[PDB]
Amino acid sequence: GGAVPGLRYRPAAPADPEKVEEIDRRLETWARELDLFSGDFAEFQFGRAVVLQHPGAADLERLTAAGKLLLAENIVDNCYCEEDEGRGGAHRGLGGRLIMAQSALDPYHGTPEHEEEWRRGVQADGPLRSYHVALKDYAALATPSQTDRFVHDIARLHLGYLAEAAWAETRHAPKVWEYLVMRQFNNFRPCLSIVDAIDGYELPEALYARPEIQRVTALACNATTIVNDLYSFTRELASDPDHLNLPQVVAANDQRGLKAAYLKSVEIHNQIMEAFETESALLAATSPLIERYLQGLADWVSGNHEWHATNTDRYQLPNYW
Amino acid sequence: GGAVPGLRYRPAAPADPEKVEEIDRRLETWARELDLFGDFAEFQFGRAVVLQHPGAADLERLTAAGKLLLAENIVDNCYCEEDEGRGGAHRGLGGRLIMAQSALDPYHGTPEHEEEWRRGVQADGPLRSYHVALKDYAALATPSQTDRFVHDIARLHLGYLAEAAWAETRHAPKVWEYLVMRQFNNFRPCLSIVDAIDGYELPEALYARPEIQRVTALACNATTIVNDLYSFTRELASDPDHLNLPQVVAANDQRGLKAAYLKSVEIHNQIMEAFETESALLAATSPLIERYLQGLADWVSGNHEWHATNTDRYQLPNYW
């Protein structure tokens, strides 16, 4: 009825409604105080998203912090990637707006005078304010190693944004593999970047940076990002048929119809999930800490899928079964 | 010898010619077997790394610094300075740079797509250079250190994309906004590797500290401004629309290029003074931090010497 038939996912327990509410309440107040906006905020379901995605969260403040980051991420995306610059003023382009967004996370250093102008520039736009203050509140809970991990994953995301915008401008028709390479960057990854911090512990960088740990993190991120493609397929087919998602790209390369492309896209997802779970299991047996991180990753993926599958307002499924 | 008058810099001991010469030989040899291609020594990659890494553990690690530097230049030249050839694939700067990032930061997915991606990276020189340079560096460095490098290259590519967006949209940045872009579009990926190249490791937990992040940026920003100062005259003739600190200062201040250039030197000096001053305080906290800060300083110093003595590529304006 609500989930994609044949899709591989672990059942997620339903989010504590009183937790969801308090989070959405807190996030609303925060957005207001930062002037980030006459509408119901609960409808975007940010509180529901983080409660599902971080079932092991150490406390409300850390859940709230995960929410602020997700909110900021969505604000920047919508205001810089989804909307063009208004006519008749200064014109910086995606590349220019994004580099200022990165600076909001990764602070500028120079002369006292130029730093002050930079600080004011960061205060002058809501999207930049949201990144700046979100990271600030997160950095108060997390280690510099953890914040630096998140900043790198945002850098990835922004490169992913710029790659997608480039292809759309140059009219590039990527093969499936190349689309998925872009989607490894243009990814939910920065939300999974924080699973240990939000749960109240740290996976040290020495472990995180290991190739085999980089691999399973990528596999989780790539799979759950594809989940977005699969649940957004129908709405995007109607609203902007030129937007790339995995089924469109499979269909454009394979030329065997959308239904075949969609079903195949589910199998690709399941294969990626399979490698995530098989390799996670092996890595989990080697270390209780690594184990705990992989469970955090798995739980994020699971909660994210549940959020998609039950958000019937924004996500509809095609009639392919 | 031939330095910007009034510029703040520290003496760099001359490069060992025997190493410079061997490094160049190795780099050209490496380049031919990866088929990335004339006198190759004219590029002076060998002299750059010898000057930039005076405390290098050995020739193998110097060579690794050369390969990274070489790969970074190849990508810059082929993707940022040159347009895609007509009549073939068109992916744009964004598209080419996302593949370049994947060359450093491996793709994971189904075995079929992973193999297609692998063939993709092998399919052109710029991606091959990144891929093999990093592989050679990772064999000598820790995974923390290679992650640090990948992050610095992500910064770089974002920096590229920012400078390109401005050229396209015809944006005239204020001086502060230009320098923000310049913190990303930066020599930083070469300063990223100074501990590993000298055969030790600054612990990431120390690297990640805000004060260490700050002094690192100060060093990187100063030495990158140094490139603006020495290339200014050349780019004046060849690419007047190419942004550098003097041009941006002059576009904003409107007091003429001479005034703007002298102001640019003063900005460099202030940022360099901050780096030295805050380095001095931080040094006493840890022998590893001290060694790292000296690596930064020696890189900045050698990079300045490299520019100041590359008579052929860089000239100075007649402002003194």
XYZ file of C-alpha atoms in Angstrom:
641
model
C 0.000 0.000 0.000
C 2.649 2.534 1.026
C 6.075 0.958 0.479
C 7.606 -0.006 -2.857
C 6.928 -3.700 -3.590
C 10.097 -5.795 -3.575
C 12.133 -3.035 -1.974
C 14.605 -4.157 0.685
C 14.146 -2.354 3.993
C 14.243 -3.081 7.709
C 11.028 -2.225 9.575
C 11.244 0.968 11.594
C 9.332 1.481 14.830
C 6.862 4.388 14.615
C 8.214 7.743 15.846
C 7.245 8.881 19.357
C 4.602 11.536 18.516
C 5.315 13.635 21.605
C 8.971 13.673 20.660
C 8.138 14.651 17.066
C 5.943 17.524 18.272
C 8.492 18.972 20.714
C 11.109 18.860 17.957
C 8.899 20.578 15.367
C 7.991 23.129 18.006
C 11.628 23.786 18.785
C 12.570 23.953 15.097
C 9.774 26.439 14.413
C 10.909 28.760 17.217
C 14.465 28.528 15.939
C 13.557 29.403 12.334
C 11.525 32.363 13.565
C 14.296 33.775 15.730
C 16.594 33.584 12.696
C 14.002 35.075 10.348
C 14.044 32.132 7.929
C 10.541 32.581 6.478
C 1.814 32.086 7.866
C 1.900 28.292 7.609
C 1.919 25.041 9.564
C 5.521 24.003 10.030
C 4.625 20.479 11.204
C 3.561 19.792 7.576
C 7.147 19.582 6.358
C 7.606 16.757 8.866
C 11.135 17.647 9.978
C 10.496 16.412 13.520
C 9.219 13.118 12.225
C 12.241 12.805 9.971
C 14.904 13.115 12.679
C 13.047 11.056 15.280
C 12.838 8.210 12.758
C 16.378 8.696 11.443
C 18.053 8.824 14.879
C 16.208 6.336 17.138
C 19.300 6.123 19.355
C 19.556 9.895 19.973
C 21.057 10.664 23.377
C 18.575 13.444 24.241
C 16.159 16.078 22.888
C 18.883 18.655 22.397
C 20.814 16.351 20.060
C 17.662 15.395 18.139
C 16.871 19.102 17.854
C 20.397 19.703 16.585
C 19.995 17.049 13.870
C 16.779 18.847 12.909
C 18.450 22.223 12.615
C 21.018 20.815 10.205
C 18.344 19.121 8.083
C 16.309 22.325 8.038
C 19.354 24.380 7.006
C 20.199 21.834 4.310
C 16.703 22.057 2.895
C 16.675 25.848 3.025
C 19.909 26.212 1.061
C 18.844 23.559 -1.433
C 15.466 25.192 -2.080
C 16.676 28.800 -2.165
C 19.910 28.286 -4.135
C 19.443 25.063 -6.159
C 15.698 25.170 -6.797
C 15.238 28.913 -7.269
C 17.142 31.196 -9.658
C 18.531 34.570 -8.641
C 15.989 37.375 -8.880
C 16.310 39.681 -11.892
C 17.918 43.074 -11.518
C 20.472 42.861 -8.738
C 23.789 41.155 -8.091
C 24.286 37.836 -9.885
C 26.658 35.211 -8.412
C 25.456 31.971 -9.960
C 25.165 28.608 -8.221
C 28.928 28.356 -7.837
C 29.079 31.745 -6.184
C 26.162 31.241 -3.840
C 27.414 27.790 -2.816
C 30.946 28.985 -2.016
C 29.425 31.503 0.423
C 27.325 28.659 1.885
C 30.521 26.618 2.375
C 32.174 29.587 4.097
C 29.234 29.769 6.508
C 30.348 26.276 7.640
C 34.096 26.564 7.082
C 34.963 30.082 8.496
C 36.989 32.664 6.611
C 40.332 33.896 8.004
C 42.159 37.063 7.002
C 42.402 40.676 8.166
C 40.066 41.894 10.928
C 38.311 44.218 8.430
C 37.618 41.580 5.763
C 36.474 39.052 8.386
C 33.913 41.571 9.687
C 32.529 42.189 6.185
C 32.389 38.427 5.677
C 30.553 37.944 8.976
C 28.006 40.576 7.932
C 27.579 38.927 4.534
C 26.800 35.650 6.294
C 24.175 37.391 8.450
C 22.505 39.038 5.464
C 20.955 35.933 3.886
C 18.650 33.450 5.646
C 20.140 30.363 3.968
C 23.670 31.362 5.075
C 22.403 32.141 8.581
C 20.814 28.694 8.802
C 24.052 26.890 7.894
C 26.088 29.127 10.185
C 23.943 28.784 13.293
C 23.067 25.122 12.666
C 26.751 24.136 12.555
C 27.396 26.338 15.579
C 24.832 24.536 17.701
C 26.014 21.148 16.462
C 29.664 22.002 17.138
C 28.684 22.653 20.754
C 27.710 19.003 21.099
C 30.192 17.360 18.727
C 33.988 17.171 18.496
C 35.967 19.269 15.983
C 36.709 15.931 14.269
C 33.002 15.315 13.954
C 32.198 18.840 12.771
C 34.996 18.603 10.208
C 33.505 15.325 8.966
C 30.148 17.028 8.451
C 31.775 19.992 6.696
C 33.486 17.636 4.256
C 30.177 15.884 3.560
C 28.549 19.274 2.839
C 31.419 20.087 0.476
C 30.573 16.787 -1.248
C 26.896 17.697 -1.405
C 27.628 21.093 -2.917
C 29.840 19.552 -5.601
C 26.950 17.174 -6.233
C 24.613 20.166 -6.659
C 26.978 21.766 -9.154
C 27.412 18.563 -11.151
C 23.647 18.121 -11.500
C 23.220 21.776 -12.546
C 26.039 21.454 -15.083
C 24.530 18.338 -16.747
C 21.139 20.061 -16.998
C 22.731 23.098 -18.619
C 25.007 21.185 -21.025
C 22.137 18.758 -21.711
C 24.174 15.693 -20.629
C 22.556 12.238 -20.713
C 24.657 10.253 -18.202
C 24.913 6.476 -18.231
C 23.419 4.881 -15.104
C 26.805 4.440 -13.477
C 27.693 8.110 -13.998
C 24.387 9.326 -12.590
C 25.028 7.187 -9.502
C 28.516 8.663 -9.132
C 26.902 12.131 -8.975
C 24.338 10.832 -6.495
C 27.099 9.617 -4.186
C 27.895 13.318 -3.599
C 24.471 14.876 -4.113
C 23.367 12.706 -1.243
C 21.664 12.367 2.181
C 25.234 11.672 3.457
C 25.525 14.796 5.656
C 22.601 13.552 7.760
C 24.321 10.193 8.264
C 27.591 12.047 8.934
C 26.220 12.772 12.405
C 24.755 9.466 13.620
C 27.408 8.875 16.303
C 27.433 12.468 17.607
C 23.621 12.580 17.863
C 23.692 9.243 19.709
C 26.224 10.619 22.195
C 29.487 8.984 21.177
C 32.317 9.376 18.664
C 33.698 7.090 16.010
C 37.273 8.374 15.863
C 38.466 9.705 12.502
C 41.137 6.974 12.405
C 38.348 4.401 12.108
C 36.010 6.474 9.968
C 38.715 7.196 7.442
C 39.559 3.519 6.860
C 38.722 2.494 3.246
C 36.432 -0.318 4.358
C 34.492 2.048 6.647
C 34.334 4.708 3.909
C 32.887 1.997 1.675
C 30.018 0.817 3.887
C 29.114 4.420 4.742
C 28.944 5.192 1.016
C 26.806 2.091 0.369
C 24.259 3.104 3.006
C 24.137 6.693 1.760
C 23.855 5.681 -1.848
C 21.028 3.219 -1.130
C 18.904 5.572 0.984
C 19.459 8.392 -1.536
C 18.101 6.075 -4.256
C 15.076 5.582 -2.017
C 14.436 9.291 -2.605
C 14.520 8.748 -6.387
C 12.063 5.833 -6.117
C 9.471 7.616 -4.005
C 9.808 10.944 -5.907
C 9.585 9.345 -9.356
C 5.861 9.880 -9.944
C 5.630 13.491 -8.699
C 8.765 14.508 -10.637
C 7.595 12.772 -13.825
C 4.672 15.193 -13.951
C 6.260 18.346 -12.488
C 9.610 18.375 -14.300
C 10.223 15.447 -16.676
C 13.791 16.717 -17.310
C 14.843 16.047 -13.732
C 17.179 13.044 -13.457
C 16.323 10.244 -11.079
C 17.453 6.611 -11.280
C 14.373 5.288 -13.117
C 14.449 8.062 -15.749
C 18.147 7.480 -16.358
C 17.806 3.698 -16.561
C 14.935 4.174 -19.031
C 16.877 6.709 -21.133
C 19.870 4.384 -21.412
C 18.025 1.040 -21.627
C 15.098 2.161 -23.809
C 12.752 -0.543 -22.518
C 10.102 1.666 -20.979
C 9.644 3.317 -17.597
C 8.087 0.302 -15.870
C 11.045 -1.910 -16.711
C 13.390 0.910 -15.708
C 11.648 1.403 -12.406
C 11.660 -2.312 -11.509
C 15.320 -2.461 -12.450
C 15.978 0.586 -10.284
C 14.546 -1.307 -7.310
C 16.893 -4.220 -8.013
C 19.857 -1.852 -8.180
C 18.844 -0.401 -4.839
C 18.518 -3.893 -3.322
C 21.930 -4.922 -4.595
C 23.556 -1.862 -2.990
C 21.703 -2.571 0.275
C 22.852 -6.196 0.121
C 26.502 -5.156 -0.070
C 25.985 -2.617 2.735
C 24.470 -5.288 5.028
C 26.843 -8.099 4.150
C 29.942 -5.927 4.595
C 28.510 -4.270 7.724
C 27.945 -7.650 9.366
C 31.563 -8.621 8.782
C 32.886 -5.297 10.031
C 30.532 -5.357 13.038
C 32.082 -8.575 14.365
C 35.519 -6.908 14.505
C 34.651 -4.115 16.924
C 31.778 -3.167 19.276
C 32.285 0.535 18.492
C 32.306 0.007 14.734
C 29.294 -2.242 15.225
C 27.487 0.580 16.982
C 28.212 3.052 14.171
C 26.975 0.589 11.547
C 23.745 0.120 13.476
C 23.367 3.917 13.588
C 23.841 3.966 9.817
C 21.390 1.105 9.337
C 18.837 2.762 11.594
C 19.112 6.054 9.694
C 18.525 4.235 6.398
C 15.578 2.349 7.870
C 13.989 5.423 9.456
C 14.464 7.424 6.259
C 12.661 4.757 4.256
C 9.785 4.658 6.723
C 9.501 8.460 6.545
C 9.281 8.282 2.732
C 6.874 5.350 2.650
C 4.438 6.986 5.047
C 4.650 10.565 3.768
C 1.864 9.913 1.296
C 1.213 13.634 0.895
C 4.514 14.249 -0.910
C 5.312 10.781 -2.260
C 3.095 8.655 -4.487
C 4.037 5.350 -6.130
C 3.599 4.381 -9.789
C 1.203 1.658 -10.950
C 3.872 -0.903 -11.794
C 2.672 -3.938 -9.740
C 66.111 37.317 -5.722
C 63.726 39.519 -7.536
C 61.085 39.556 -4.811
C 58.187 41.951 -4.439
C 59.624 44.983 -2.655
C 58.109 45.340 0.845
C 56.682 41.826 0.888
C 56.945 39.885 4.162
C 58.775 36.600 3.676
C 61.268 34.223 5.231
C 64.561 33.099 3.583
C 64.475 29.720 1.845
C 67.698 27.729 1.510
C 68.401 26.979 -2.163
C 67.125 23.710 -3.587
C 69.475 20.745 -3.907
C 69.916 20.556 -7.716
C 70.588 16.843 -7.578
C 67.163 16.221 -6.016
C 65.386 18.721 -8.300
C 66.845 16.946 -11.276
C 65.982 13.464 -10.014
C 62.400 14.525 -9.074
C 61.840 15.963 -12.562
C 63.147 12.767 -14.174
C 60.797 10.660 -12.062
C 57.805 12.893 -12.715
C 58.274 12.858 -16.480
C 58.788 9.115 -16.419
C 55.606 8.744 -14.319
C 53.788 11.047 -16.723
C 54.767 9.039 -19.807
C 53.633 5.668 -18.406
C 50.258 7.167 -17.495
C 50.304 8.862 -20.901
C 49.441 12.332 -19.622
C 51.241 14.145 -22.450
C 59.293 19.279 -25.002
C 61.508 20.093 -22.015
C 59.628 18.940 -18.916
C 62.069 20.576 -16.477
C 60.872 24.019 -17.633
C 57.706 23.453 -15.620
C 59.957 23.395 -12.558
C 57.802 20.901 -10.615
C 61.010 19.438 -9.196
C 62.231 22.768 -7.944
C 58.823 23.573 -6.459
C 58.559 20.461 -4.280
C 62.204 20.501 -3.190
C 61.767 24.142 -2.140
C 58.296 23.527 -0.680
C 59.242 20.441 1.368
C 62.750 20.986 2.763
C 62.119 18.543 5.616
C 60.940 15.744 3.307
C 61.720 12.297 4.796
C 63.256 11.008 1.551
C 63.150 11.101 -2.253
C 60.193 8.717 -2.350
C 58.044 11.129 -0.359
C 59.280 14.175 -2.280
C 58.284 12.337 -5.424
C 54.831 11.696 -4.043
C 54.449 15.426 -3.394
C 55.498 16.008 -6.998
C 52.860 13.606 -8.333
C 50.049 15.281 -6.411
C 51.217 18.703 -7.555
C 51.520 17.453 -11.133
C 48.078 15.891 -11.054
C 46.540 19.036 -9.571
C 48.009 21.136 -12.406
C 46.897 18.706 -15.107
C 43.296 18.801 -13.872
C 43.374 22.610 -13.479
C 44.792 23.080 -16.971
C 42.608 20.556 -18.760
C 39.318 21.210 -16.953
C 39.353 24.834 -15.706
C 41.522 26.602 -18.287
C 40.333 24.627 -21.325
C 36.806 24.052 -22.597
C 35.516 20.622 -23.616
C 36.294 19.783 -27.243
C 33.498 20.485 -29.733
C 31.154 17.787 -31.026
C 31.536 15.154 -28.337
C 30.408 14.725 -24.755
C 29.534 17.935 -22.897
C 29.462 17.619 -19.062
C 30.484 21.155 -18.009
C 32.956 22.156 -15.287
C 30.659 20.685 -12.633
C 30.435 17.349 -14.465
C 34.159 17.021 -15.070
C 35.008 18.022 -11.509
C 32.574 15.517 -9.976
C 34.403 12.784 -11.926
C 37.714 14.252 -10.723
C 36.449 14.048 -7.135
C 35.387 10.436 -7.680
C 38.951 9.724 -8.832
C 40.063 10.664 -5.314
C 36.997 9.579 -3.413
C 36.033 6.116 -4.758
C 32.567 5.238 -6.006
C 30.695 2.360 -4.306
C 27.609 0.654 -5.747
C 26.842 -2.536 -7.718
C 29.796 -4.477 -9.161
C 28.666 -3.687 -12.750
C 28.575 0.096 -12.204
C 31.786 0.083 -10.147
C 33.603 -1.477 -13.096
C 32.124 1.041 -15.546
C 33.285 3.800 -13.229
C 36.775 2.289 -13.029
C 36.971 2.260 -16.829
C 35.682 5.831 -16.721
C 38.552 7.014 -14.537
C 41.142 5.152 -16.638
C 39.595 6.745 -19.741
C 41.330 10.101 -19.518
C 44.588 11.513 -18.261
C 43.371 14.096 -15.749
C 41.351 11.458 -13.850
C 44.255 8.971 -14.106
C 46.701 11.502 -12.658
C 44.491 12.181 -9.591
C 43.760 8.503 -9.118
C 47.368 7.292 -9.257
C 48.873 10.286 -7.432
C 46.539 9.715 -4.477
C 47.084 5.951 -4.519
C 50.827 6.584 -4.382
C 50.360 9.085 -1.562
C 47.979 6.872 0.436
C 50.657 4.138 0.486
C 52.868 6.562 2.426
C 50.286 8.397 4.540
C 47.601 7.504 7.064
C 43.925 7.240 6.087
C 43.305 10.317 8.265
C 45.904 12.198 6.223
C 44.464 11.101 2.879
C 40.955 12.075 4.045
C 42.315 15.511 4.976
C 43.741 15.766 1.464
C 40.482 14.743 -0.192
C 38.639 17.402 1.800
C 41.164 20.047 0.716
C 40.679 19.020 -2.937
C 36.887 19.235 -2.511
C 37.469 22.832 -1.281
C 39.652 23.488 -4.332
C 37.066 22.204 -6.832
C 34.334 24.280 -5.163
C 36.746 27.230 -5.451
C 37.124 26.543 -9.186
C 33.376 26.447 -9.591
C 32.917 29.714 -7.690
C 35.472 31.573 -9.810
C 33.841 30.179 -12.951
C 30.344 31.184 -11.842
C 31.571 34.774 -11.321
C 33.250 34.903 -14.730
C 30.033 33.684 -16.302
C 27.600 35.867 -14.376
C 30.009 38.851 -14.703
C 30.124 39.318 -10.901
C 32.406 41.983 -9.412
C 33.259 40.760 -5.902
C 34.263 43.045 -3.068
C 37.801 42.359 -1.846
C 36.521 40.307 1.092
C 34.351 38.077 -1.100
C 37.231 37.517 -3.538
C 39.466 36.354 -0.656
C 36.775 34.005 0.593
C 36.752 32.327 -2.818
C 40.542 32.371 -2.679
C 40.576 30.470 0.623
C 39.029 27.566 -1.302
C 40.641 28.109 -4.714
C 43.950 27.789 -2.997
C 47.405 26.161 -2.623
C 45.973 24.359 0.418
C 46.052 20.792 -1.007
C 49.844 21.101 -1.160
C 50.068 22.338 2.451
C 47.731 19.461 3.334
C 50.517 16.954 3.041
C 53.424 18.640 4.852
C 53.554 16.262 7.847
C 53.200 13.080 5.818
C 55.866 14.197 3.329
C 58.268 14.794 6.242
C 57.404 11.351 7.582
C 55.218 12.057 10.609
C 51.562 12.746 11.445
C 49.795 15.655 13.090
C 46.924 13.896 14.896
C 43.591 14.732 13.293
C 42.101 15.738 16.670
C 44.753 18.436 16.794
C 44.347 19.326 13.097
C 40.611 19.751 13.510
C 40.911 22.304 16.322
C 39.564 25.751 15.269
C 42.845 27.515 16.136
C 44.795 25.050 13.985
C 42.204 25.403 11.227
C 42.725 29.179 11.490
C 46.522 29.322 11.349
C 46.463 26.769 8.487
C 44.055 29.008 6.531
C 46.192 32.065 7.251
C 49.265 30.334 5.792
C 47.362 29.029 2.770
C 45.713 32.383 2.112
C 48.967 34.296 2.333
C 50.904 32.007 0.005
C 48.021 31.949 -2.464
C 47.909 35.751 -2.490
C 51.619 35.484 -3.283
C 50.683 33.842 -6.561
C 48.339 36.794 -7.344
C 51.199 39.240 -6.750
C 53.736 37.535 -8.997
C 51.362 36.610 -11.827
C 49.615 40.038 -11.895
C 51.720 41.616 -14.639
C 51.427 38.587 -16.911
C 47.670 38.239 -16.482
C 47.269 41.967 -17.076
C 48.450 41.406 -20.644
C 47.004 37.950 -21.312
C 43.730 37.757 -19.356
C 42.550 41.179 -18.083
C 39.258 39.702 -16.893
C 41.038 37.177 -14.714
C 40.549 38.134 -11.064
C 43.490 38.575 -8.715
C 43.881 40.620 -5.547
C 45.317 43.779 -7.162
C 42.643 43.808 -9.876
C 39.848 43.277 -7.375
C 41.259 45.918 -5.006
C 41.506 48.326 -7.953
C 38.026 47.565 -9.226
C 36.542 48.284 -5.807
C 38.693 51.211 -4.604
C 39.166 52.996 -7.920
C 42.481 54.532 -6.911
C 44.484 52.989 -9.768
C 46.422 49.753 -10.165
C 49.647 50.997 -8.555
C 47.844 51.918 -5.323
C 45.825 48.683 -5.500
C 48.953 46.548 -5.865
C 50.747 48.176 -2.940
C 47.606 47.693 -0.942
C 47.573 44.031 -2.002
C 51.096 43.572 -0.625
C 50.005 45.154 2.655
C 47.017 42.816 2.900
C 49.349 39.847 2.296
C 51.701 41.114 4.955
C 48.946 41.470 7.537
C 47.665 37.939 6.942
C 51.206 36.567 6.995
C 51.904 38.436 10.217
C 48.809 36.851 11.765
C 50.005 33.410 10.720
C 53.466 33.944 12.230
C 52.152 35.516 15.425
C 49.531 32.885 16.160
C 51.959 30.109 15.111
C 54.395 31.289 17.760
C 51.830 30.929 20.540
C 50.548 27.545 19.374
C 54.047 26.027 18.925
C 54.595 25.579 22.665
C 51.586 23.340 23.184
C 52.886 20.236 21.370
C 56.040 19.099 19.578
C 53.819 17.740 16.815
C 51.953 21.031 16.397
C 55.324 22.807 16.412
C 56.667 20.563 13.659
C 53.491 21.057 11.613
C 53.597 24.853 11.971
C 57.228 24.789 10.834
C 56.197 22.642 7.852
C 53.548 25.242 6.952
C 56.059 28.057 7.305
C 58.715 26.289 5.279
C 56.142 25.537 2.531
C 55.111 29.205 2.387
C 58.765 30.237 2.352
C 59.784 27.807 -0.383
C 56.729 28.653 -2.467
C 57.655 32.306 -2.280
C 61.252 31.573 -3.290
C 59.932 29.521 -6.222
C 57.822 32.436 -7.532
C 60.456 35.067 -6.857
C 63.077 33.174 -8.856
C 60.935 31.965 -11.734
C 62.169 34.840 -13.887
C 60.540 33.409 -16.986
C 57.018 32.921 -15.801
C 56.588 35.830 -13.423
C 57.529 39.499 -13.743
C 56.967 42.456 -11.437
C 55.247 45.773 -12.264
C 57.182 49.021 -12.156
C 55.603 50.347 -8.973
C 58.731 51.101 -6.911
